[PDB]
Amino acid sequence: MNLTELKNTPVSELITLGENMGLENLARMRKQDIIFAILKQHAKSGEDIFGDGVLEILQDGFGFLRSADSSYLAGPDDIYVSPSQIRRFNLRTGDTISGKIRPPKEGERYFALLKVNEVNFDKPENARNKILFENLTPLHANSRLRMERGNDSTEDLTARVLDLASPIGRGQRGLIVAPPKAGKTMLLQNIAQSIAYNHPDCVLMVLLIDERP
Amino acid sequence: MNLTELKNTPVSELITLGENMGLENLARMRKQDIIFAILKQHAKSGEDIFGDGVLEILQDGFGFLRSADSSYLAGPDDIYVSPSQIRRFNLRTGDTISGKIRPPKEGERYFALLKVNEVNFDKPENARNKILFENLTPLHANSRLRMERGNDSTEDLTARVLDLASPIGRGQRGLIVAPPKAGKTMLLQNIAQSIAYNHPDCVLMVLLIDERPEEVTEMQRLVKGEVVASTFDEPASRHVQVAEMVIEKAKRLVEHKKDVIILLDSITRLARAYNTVVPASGKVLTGGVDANALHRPKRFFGAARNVEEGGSLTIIATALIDTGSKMDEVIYEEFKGTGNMELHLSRKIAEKRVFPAIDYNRSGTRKEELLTTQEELQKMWILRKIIHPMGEIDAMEFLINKLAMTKTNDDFFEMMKRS
Amino acid sequence: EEVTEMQRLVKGEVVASTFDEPASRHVQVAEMVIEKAKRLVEHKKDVIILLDSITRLARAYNTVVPASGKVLTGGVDANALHRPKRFFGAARNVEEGGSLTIIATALIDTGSKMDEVIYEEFKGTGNMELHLSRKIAEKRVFPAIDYNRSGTRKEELLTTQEELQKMWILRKIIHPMGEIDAMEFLINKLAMTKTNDDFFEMMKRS
Numbered sequence A: 001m002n003l004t005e006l007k008n009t010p011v012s013e014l015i016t017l018g019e020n021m022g023l024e025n026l027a028r029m030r031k032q033d034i035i036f037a038i039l040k041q042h043a044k045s046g047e048d049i050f051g052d053g054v055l056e057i058l059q060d061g062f063g064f065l066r067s068a069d070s071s072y073l074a075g076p077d078d079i080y081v082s083p084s085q086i087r088r089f090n091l092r093t094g095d096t097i098s099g100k101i102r103p104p105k106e107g108e109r110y111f112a113l114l115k116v117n118e119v120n121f122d123k124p125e126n127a128r129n130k131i132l133f134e135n136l137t138p139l140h141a142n143s144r145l146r147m148e149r150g151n152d153s154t155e156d157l158t159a160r161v162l163d164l165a166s167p168i169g170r171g172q173r174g175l176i177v178a179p180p181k182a183g184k185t186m187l188l189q190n191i192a193q194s195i196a197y198n199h200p201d202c203v204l205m206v207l208l209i210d211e212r213p
Numbered sequence B: 001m002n003l004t005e006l007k008n009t010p011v012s013e014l015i016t017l018g019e020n021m022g023l024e025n026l027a028r029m030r031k032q033d034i035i036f037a038i039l040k041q042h043a044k045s046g047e048d049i050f051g052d053g054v055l056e057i058l059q060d061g062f063g064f065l066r067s068a069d070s071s072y073l074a075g076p077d078d079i080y081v082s083p084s085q086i087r088r089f090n091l092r093t094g095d096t097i098s099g100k101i102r103p104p105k106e107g108e109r110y111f112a113l114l115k116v117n118e119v120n121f122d123k124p125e126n127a128r129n130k131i132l133f134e135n136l137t138p139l140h141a142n143s144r145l146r147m148e149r150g151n152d153s154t155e156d157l158t159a160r161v162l163d164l165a166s167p168i169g170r171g172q173r174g175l176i177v178a179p180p181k182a183g184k185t186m187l188l189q190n191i192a193q194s195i196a197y198n199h200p201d202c203v204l205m206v207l208l209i210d211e212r213p214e215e216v217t218e219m220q221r222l223v224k225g226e227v228v229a230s231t232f233d234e235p236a237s238r239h240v241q242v243a244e245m246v247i248e249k250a251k252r253l254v255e256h257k258k259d260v261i262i263l264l265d266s267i268t269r270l271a272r273a274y275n276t277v278v279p280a281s282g283k284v285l286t287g288g289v290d291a292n293a294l295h296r297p298k299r300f301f302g303a304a305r306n307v308e309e310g311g312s313l314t315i316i317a318t319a320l321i322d323t324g325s326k327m328d329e330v331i332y333e334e335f336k337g338t339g340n341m342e343l344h345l346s347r348k349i350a351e352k353r354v355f356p357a358i359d360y361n362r363s364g365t366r367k368e369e370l371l372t373t374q375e376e377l378q379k380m381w382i383l384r385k386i387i388h389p390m391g392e393i394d395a396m397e398f399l400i401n402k403l404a405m406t407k408t409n410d411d412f413f414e415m416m417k418r419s
Numbered sequence C: 001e002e003v004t005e006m007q008r009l010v011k012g013e014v015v016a017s018t019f020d021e022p023a024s025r026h027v028q029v030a031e032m033v034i035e036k037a038k039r040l041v042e043h044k045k046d047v048i049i050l051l052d053s054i055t056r057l058a059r060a061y062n063t064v065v066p067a068s069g070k071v072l073t074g075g076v077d078a079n080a081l082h083r084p085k086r087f088f089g090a091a092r093n094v095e096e097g098g099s100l101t102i103i104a105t106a107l108i109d110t111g112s113k114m115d116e117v118i119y120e121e122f123k124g125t126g127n128m129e130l131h132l133s134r135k136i137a138e139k140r141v142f143p144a145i146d147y148n149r150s151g152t153r154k155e156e157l158l159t160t161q162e163e164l165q166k167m168w169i170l171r172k173i174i175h176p177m178g179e180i181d182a183m184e185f186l187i188n189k190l191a192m193t194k195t196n197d198d199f200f201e202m203m204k205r206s
Ligand SMILES: Nc1ncnc2c1ncn2[C@@H]1O[C@H](COP(=O)(O)OP(=O)(O)O)[C@@H](O)[C@H]1O
Pocket: A156, A158, A178, A179, A180, A181, A182, A183, A184, A185, A186, A187, B366, B367, B368, B369
């Protein structure tokens, strides 16, 4: 019924859910196609379907609601939004759109957004009055982020050394100079553990380029 | 009566079998045509004929059941399957299909599958519920593969050095950097012997691209497993066709909780055929290699994964450098950081008649903690500390003499503890 | 022998004229069929006429009509082809009730210029065109129908909203393919499907 919870389910459970519903031959196909097939069959019952994701705008003018679970990969389960809805609600690439999605009619291969009731975890009307990021005035970092972890008390001293060598604050634009085979990967992992522990409120996002599966 | 056993028979015996049956003039023709002729004559008797092979699907929609014995080469003896049977049983390129085959009627030149009773060495109904390979979650290698052989006790120390230089596990995506005339061919052969000996359960597949016909025959005799190769005289499209056949077959076996090890030779040769086959996009980069041309080798090489649910796919490839070509250099650069274990060979070491010509300092592996044990890992670190100050050439003869007078690697490890 | 086979196979009223009969006989029977059909249409009945062939029918009409003193290209007078136009154009859908459906066959590439001139004047007169290809028949693939060339007008009224969209999707895939490769592509898909509905839902997968 809900798009976000369906993708988080294991693939093994996903096949079992579709078998009892009435679908067949869902085992030997990609997980993205299974989700589209299950939603298509469930749409015939007439029950409302909820969907959410990150909205992007193409060069033609129309956009799609990508999902962060699949690393924003194009798929048949992506939600299509008409350019008309963009005029009603000022949306740009990056924002999160959540709302009901209608079954795709004949001739279209993507679900269409029916009504949006949540924009950036906020009321859509309130999101329309937000100021753009480029008009904001930047400043120097002033909020200290305690990278040291006391409760864990692990044998690794990377967190303790990082605070002494170079303290990290909110809004920093630092870079790491790491030669190959110098523990670069584990360095980021240790930082991520402290951020998720010392500052749970802060949103942590990890982006990796050209990394092994 | 059975297709698989008929192809394994010697060609000399194949002629004799057809002569007494009633056929004539089978001596001066290709072996593939003889098999088709014998099956055609035997089909007149009405006896059932059993056939098996690797199934592939063409772009039109119909498929053929290629045989791994002939390196998946198209022939008159290939089994044809109607697209209707594909709907009944979900089949994709790579899977093995075994069952009865009916005689070809007039108007068709290929045998047709009548009833399938074995899919991927399993019941066809059970194979329909297998989870796709792309949906599996990859993980780091954790199953240590002991490359050292104790019973053989041969004078070659390549197996002993390989474990010390870079341990190899299940699901590794390592590559070998081998200059020309640096013992690259024998390096793969030694690895194949240990895999067929230490881990008989693991499926070993060897794929060779642009290799001489005499080199392919030697590989089949030496390697105790499935060996498929494409000769240089064959077109570049043939190289692409066989390359996709091996990986697709491996993926299907991995879905059945099986471990597949693939010895690739070579990525540079494989990328050479891929670049030619793909049509030009109107833009040419440096070295005459398009960006989309190398996309296909990346898919093939990146498929080496360790399945959390069960099974693993290990791919070991070879990279050619200092060959006097630029294309081969550009290909190597994009395939540097894609591997889990690097094994770099040095031509200068081979010039000193010291084997194996392996650069210990340059070679290495990632996440070696999972493969080796706590005690074994510390010993390797101590050895690397001594080797690092020494040069890339002096390190080998230093290591060779130490391993020469020791029985196993454990005896060598305790000797270094004395110093 | 062709007339006898048609009578045995077709479950209906079959009338035909042999080649040995004079051209005036062909004209007499042609007017008989259409006049009979028109009377039945007036009684709120539906009549379907399978015509074979317009080129053969125009051949007899040209000979029967006396010469007007002027000969056009191909030896066919302007008034000579007036009669086939009346016969072919009578296919109408009556608003009050009933309809008259006329399906005819046109011969092309027969080695005669006259048969080409007749076809040219009868191009834009039809509601649906069905063009056959000899090359497809040479490949032993049947029916030898040119899908790209074939078409119909006002297909919205005949088919439904759901059925019409499925046909448009199929035509989009077929159009890039050649006139010959489209048939064997379509034949295998229809061979393994029971009905057209099963074929339609299969194309939706792609
Ligand atoms: N904080 C740490 N403590 C102990 N060992 C570490 C630490 N960070 C990295 N390593 C060692 O580094 C190796 C992995 O290095 P890697 O992350 O591949 O380096 P790079 O990211 O520069 O390629 C591991 O074998 C691990 O033993």
